[PDB]
From a paper:
ERα contains structurally conserved globular domains of the nuclear receptor superfamily, including a DNA‐binding domain (DBD) that is connected by a flexible hinge region to the ligand‐binding domain (LBD), as well as unstructured AB and F domains at its amino and carboxyl termini, respectively. AF‐2 binds the signature LxxLL motif peptides of coactivators such as NCOA1/2/3 (also known as SRC‐1/2/3).
Direct modulators like tamoxifen drive AF‐1‐dependent cell‐specific activity by completely occluding AF‐2, but it is not known how indirect modulators produce cell‐specific ERα activity. These structures demonstrated that cell‐specific activity derived from altering the shape of the AF‐2 surface without an extended side chain. Ligands in cluster 2 and cluster 3 showed conformational heterogeneity in parts of the scaffold that were directed toward multiple regions of the receptor including h3, h8, h11, h12, and/or the β‐sheets. We observed a difference of 0.4 Å that was significant (two‐tailed Student's t‐test, P = 0.002) due to the very tight clustering of the 2,5‐DTP‐induced LBD conformation.
Numbering used by the authors:
A (entry chain A): 305 to 461, 464 to 550
B (entry chain C), D (entry chain D): 687 to 696
C (entry chain B): 305 to 549
The structure:
């Protein structure tokens, strides 16, 4: 089936090479921030990141084996999670700050410009602090990000073809588990430290799920208040969660 | 139809 | 704290001994459901279940070591996740059904008695199927549930200042112990080292979906609150106001 | 002063 036949180090390389680039913001220091304008920047950025994500996802081993229907569902379910773990990752070296872009580095007090957004910034900054405390490695990050892609929507899939696709996904997920463990072993962690750290990293995905759900609702309310014009792509991702 | 569906082909 | 000195077997025993009882629904005697009727029963059950959860939480090793404020925060954040994972657990042996109580076993289609609730049932049922497909063990269940209690709200521990840092480190230490306990159970079950790690990953990733169901459930319950389809208890309203304001 | 507070001590 390919993907399954990959070694750990092969798995790592594939994920590392598939990594999307860091994009810039259309941030214009000419004008002061407004709620509408900050929401404009952030969502414009998200939109352009999405296109790269979609293409990144296809380079995640096992993902293109799935139906178009299943690829869509997985991405629809996990897109904001995937954006957030990437953000939290590149924000690691910047305590008290979120590096949305190299030209867009925001602290929590700048998040207060948008109503109810500082709560989301606070959670994001805490996660970044958590990753920094754990000394999260790049190889570990790309494993976690692929795990989010394959797992977050797998439970929301009758039929037997639907079970064949579910099984295949879990096969690949188990492969990344093997990859993560192998990484920690190579890094010289004890056998005990291996399963302890594996647990720590995966439990963070529960908070990332939480941040996404709070983020989805916040973005949705901004939409329903006509604060920001969203791309048709974003409207469709947002729509996939119903929300209210 | 859906943009995401279209993008997953291009 | 004599929580970090527990053996893996003593951890299991403590959690099993701490287990809350399976409450009954007042569903009487069997009148045809309505929207207000089912919401009434479900929320009534939830309120009664919550009181027991709080005493169960106090018996989770390491939990009572935390400040009053932090204990409150952990329960406020995790209460619906804890109910849901319990619901899913006792619904394992009843495929396509949700055992809210021994006398309240709901089919999927009965979730359509309440607007928008069937989608939440669907997610709970899918989780139940995964547990069943994994052949989830009781000792594993109590480990996962305790993990949810300690893990869900520890990141939102605002004030990363002073003796709140000591708190967070304590919680992570206990979490490691429970992790060790899960692995111990799998090792005892005869799983290979690779099988152990894979199953651990599989169980914890389910907690990501349990978080999702809780966030959606909170939103639904809030919408039902505002529409006044059902009068909620003071306790429920408080737990609900923790995710809002 | 919340109900949760009371039950945690009780
Ligand atoms: C505008 C938001 C904040 C920034 C959010 C956002 C944008 C781009 C990212 O790369 C990212 F990681 C991220 F999280 C996207 C939305 C979610 C909640 C708010 O409405
Ligand atoms: C009434 C609800 C459905 C059942 C929910 C619920 C009740 C009791 C449980 O033991 C449980 F596990 C559970 F999930 C509680 C709320 C959440 C969304 C709906 O409004």
């Amino acid at each position: 089936s390919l993907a399954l036949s990959l070694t750990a180090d092969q798995m790592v390389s594939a994920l590392l090479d598939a990594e999307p680039p860091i994009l810039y913001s259309e941030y214009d220091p000419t004008r002061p921030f407004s709620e509408a304008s900050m929401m404009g920047l952030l969502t414009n950025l998200a939109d352009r990141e999405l296109v790269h994500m979609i293409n990144w996802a296809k380079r995640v081993p096992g993902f293109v084996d799935l139906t178009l229907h299943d690829q869509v569902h997985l991405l629809e379910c996990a897109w904001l999670e995937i954006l957030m773990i990437g953000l939290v990752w590149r924000s690691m070296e910047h305590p008290g700050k979120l590096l949305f872009a190299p030209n867009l580095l925001l602290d929590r007090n700048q998040g207060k410009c948008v109503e109810g957004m500082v709560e989301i910034f606070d959670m994001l900054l805490a996660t970044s602090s958590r990753f920094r405390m754990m000394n999260l490695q790049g190889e570990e990050f790309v494993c976690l990000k692929s795990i989010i892609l394959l797992n977050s929507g797998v439970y929301t899939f009758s039929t037997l073809k639907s079970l064949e696709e579910k099984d295949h996904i879990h096969r690949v997920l188990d492969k990344i588990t093997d990859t993560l463990i192998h990484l920690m072993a190579k890094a010289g962690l004890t056998l005990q430290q291996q399963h302890q750290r594996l647990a720590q990293l995966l439990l963070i995905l529960s908070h990332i799920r939480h941040m996404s759900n709070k983020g989805m609702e916040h973005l949705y309310s901004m939409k329903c208040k006509n604060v920001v014009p969203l791309s048709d792509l974003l409207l469709e991702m947002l729509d996939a969660h119903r929300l209210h | 139809h859906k943009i995401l569906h279209r993008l997953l082909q291009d």
